[PDB]
């Protein structure tokens, strides 16, 4: 039921740029649907970072920047720190299932 495709894992040096991507099928999630991004520390509740593909809530650092084009969506991280390692999730709305869906979850590792 993973209509959104995510990279199983990714890694990078601290203070560097990493990009996390999320895309879905064509007859499923379309151009109008927007993609939100969730962070999950181990053993904790998922935390929101970016919604609306370009907006962040209060308290979310400006370092996390995302964008959505067509169907594919992606994040950009600047100034990677040891606190950024977590379980990241992409999620959006599937018009064919009439219900929300979640990405497979990507592993961000600090090197």
């Amino acid at each position: 039921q993973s209509v959104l495709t995510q990279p199983p894992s990714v890694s990078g040096a601290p203070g560097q740029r990493v990009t996390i991507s999320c895309t879905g099928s064509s007859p499923n999630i379309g151009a109008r649907n927007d993609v939100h991004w969730y962070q999950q520390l181990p053993g904790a509740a998922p935390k929101l970072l970016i919604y609306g593909n370009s907006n962040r809530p209060s308290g979310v650092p400006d370092r996390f920047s995302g964008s959505k084009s067509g169907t594919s969506a992606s994040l950009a991280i600047t100034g990677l720190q040891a606190e950024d390692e977590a379980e990241y999730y992409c999620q959006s709305y599937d018009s064919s299932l009439s219900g929300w869906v979640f990405g497979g979850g990507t592993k961000l590792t600090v090197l």
């Binding site: 993973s2 927007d34 509740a45 929101l48």
Partner: protein, 126 residues
Amino acid sequence: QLQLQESGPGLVKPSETLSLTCTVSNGSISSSTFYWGWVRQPPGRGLEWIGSIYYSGSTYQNPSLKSRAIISVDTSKNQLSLKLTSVTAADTAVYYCARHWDVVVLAAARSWFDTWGQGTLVTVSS
């Protein structure tokens, strides 16, 4: 600030009903503006949306688990109730009560989950 407290039996024998309930503090479940929902995440897998429910009784619900999941809401005791039947070994997961899907202005495609519970690790064993 809005807090969620959900509880339930963390161990359930195979093949009968499983039941949890979330509590809302510093707020009201009667709040018409937002929806309320349940999200489960099996260990070593991704998040999965099991259904969302409005205060009146209208229910969002994933077709894949149509025949097993029943969700009920009450506004008097501010309790969000979730039931799951015919639980098998594939249903081992940690369940979360979530608040999302604003009704007044956002549409059903731009809805994002906003408030998350602490989670309850629930397993089925013989």
